[PDB]
Symmetry: C2
Subunit: 390 residues, 2 copies
């Protein structure tokens, strides 16, 4: 049975869409083959979002995949929470527990506040992009009064792209008015690598400085350019390349055509592309279970206009939302378990540190099974020569 | 000439709507009398906003008055910035300089940061509601590193109304 699904994709993020098409190849079963309505449109303009939304709402699709802006999130949480259509995303999670919102990105503030407690920091700069919301900023400031932290938080998303060369030299000198050796960046991998090149411009990546990157794409940045710079860089990576299940994907991912699938032939991969491929695994296993539960949802465009006043939706999507939240499958991000609100649970975030040989895992964080350093390399039992400083 | 205008009003804010009707009495000229399309709807649900918006967009009104949530602001700035219809509000001002957005509330962070410099504070708590955006929080924190201020900022909008006595 051909299943019409949503196909929202921002323009230029086609590597994720390439990873979406791999999931359409990998997870196409003989029982059903999903029908994407692919719309390569802008994500910041909610007018552009809603017109692509209501057209796919006129299609009567059963699950919509896409990204969202912090502008377009209050559009999607309003419509999908009302029009009873489940939405799947790898974007940054919503604060409000909105129904019909499934989201592939695990929360990072629990690992992040645990990481500062590991490094035992007391005063540190916090550069953040405003574009992914300010919840992690709200996360660190509530612990800042609690753990007595003098956080120096400065937004960096306000800088226009035309003169983002002089402003950083003004910015880091203002950081050197207080001489911060402890910087937590929070940006997209473009705006990460922009500010990284600004650190290399001012040269303050020597030993003594410390840098924490606050996205899942620790491997997605330019690791080599400050691999040997001197400062200590520690971050979070969800895409554990050490796993054979991940490696056999990369054995298939890197051998793809780069011209047909842009961004595929590289051995690395964005975590957003990884969560896009994992989302197809969840969406297939859902309709593999709906075909087993035999809840027939055969809709034409009875949904139609989204301007129906009032629009009363077909309530079988509620159980579709439930059976999506009943999915517990493994993936590239480990185990994928959901709550009743669409947030991910029973996951594991791998703490990575940039070393001389490259990135390096020191341990892992999970939600209640919290940050455990992992070590072995000798398996203990040695003499342990006690370093006596004097 | 009867001029059709927008009539968005959140429910329970009818004292403002009462003050709107006083202006409809006070400022009705003999040249023209404005035609409100009054919609007493929820402001947090952008689906409820857009349906009242597109109905008044189906009216072809020339200027829309209302309030907005921090949820519904990215709806109005998207549509009115594209559909070329000017919007008038007393709500908290938008960060982005969006066209077709007229807003009656003057900015307060310039007076507020000047007030702290008057009282000459160095460390102070900052309790804030998240509902009007976080721009004033961004305003004080950019001056906090600048003027060496140890601001203790704690959101208070996260507390539910059922147990807002123990928290």
């Amino acid at each position: 049975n051909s299943i019409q699904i949503g196909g929202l994709f921002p323009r230029g993020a086609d590597q994720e869409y390439s990873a979406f098409r791999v999931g359409m190849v990998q997870f196409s079963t003989s029982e059903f083959r999903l029908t994407p309505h692919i719309d390569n449109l802008e994500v910041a303009n909610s007018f552009a979002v809603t017109n692509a939304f209501c057209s796919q709402f006129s299609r009567g699709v059963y699950a919509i995949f896409g990204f969202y802006d912090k502008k377009s999130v209050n559009t999607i949480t309003s419509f999908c929470g009302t029009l009873h259509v489940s939405f799947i995303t790898p974007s940054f999670p919503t604060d409000g527990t909105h129904p019909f919102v499934i989201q592939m990105r695990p929360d990072l503030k629990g690992a992040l506040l645990s990481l500062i407690e590991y490094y035992q920091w007391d005063k540190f700069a916090y550069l953040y992009d405003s574009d992914r919301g300010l919840s992690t900023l709200q996360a660190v400031l509530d612990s800042a009064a609690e753990k007595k932290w003098q956080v120096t938080a400065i937004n960096v998303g306000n800088i226009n792209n035309d003169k983002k060369d002089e402003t950083y030299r003004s910015l880091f000198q203002d950081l050197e008015l207080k001489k911060e050796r402890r910087v937590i960046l929070d940006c997209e991998r473009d705006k990460v690598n922009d500010i990284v090149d600004q650190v290399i411009t001012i040269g303050k990546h020597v030993k003594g400085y410390h840098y924490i990157i606050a996205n899942l794409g620790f491997t997605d940045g330019d690791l080599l350019k400050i691999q040997f710079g001197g400062a200590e860089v520690s971050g979070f990576q969800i895409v554990d390349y050490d796993d054979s299940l991940v490696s056999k994907f990369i054995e298939r991912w890197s051998t793809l055509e780069e011209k047909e699938y842009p961004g595929a032939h590289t051995a690395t991969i964005k975590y957003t592309s990884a969560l896009t491929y994992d989302a197809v695994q969840v969406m297939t296993e859902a309709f593999r279970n709906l075909r087993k539960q035999r809840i027939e949802i055969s809709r034409r465009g009875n949904a139609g206009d989204c301007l129906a006043n009032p629009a009363v939706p077909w309530g079988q999507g509620v159980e579709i939302e439930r059976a999506l939240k009943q999915v517990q499958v493994e993936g590239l991000s480990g185990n994928i378990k959901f709550d009743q609100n669409g947030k991910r649970i029973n996951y594991t975030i791998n703490i990575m540190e940039l070393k001389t040989n490259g990135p390096r895992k020191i341990g892992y964080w999970s939600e209640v099974d919290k940050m455990v350093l992992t070590e072995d390399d000798t398996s203990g039992l040695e003499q342990k020569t006690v370093v006596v400083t004097t």
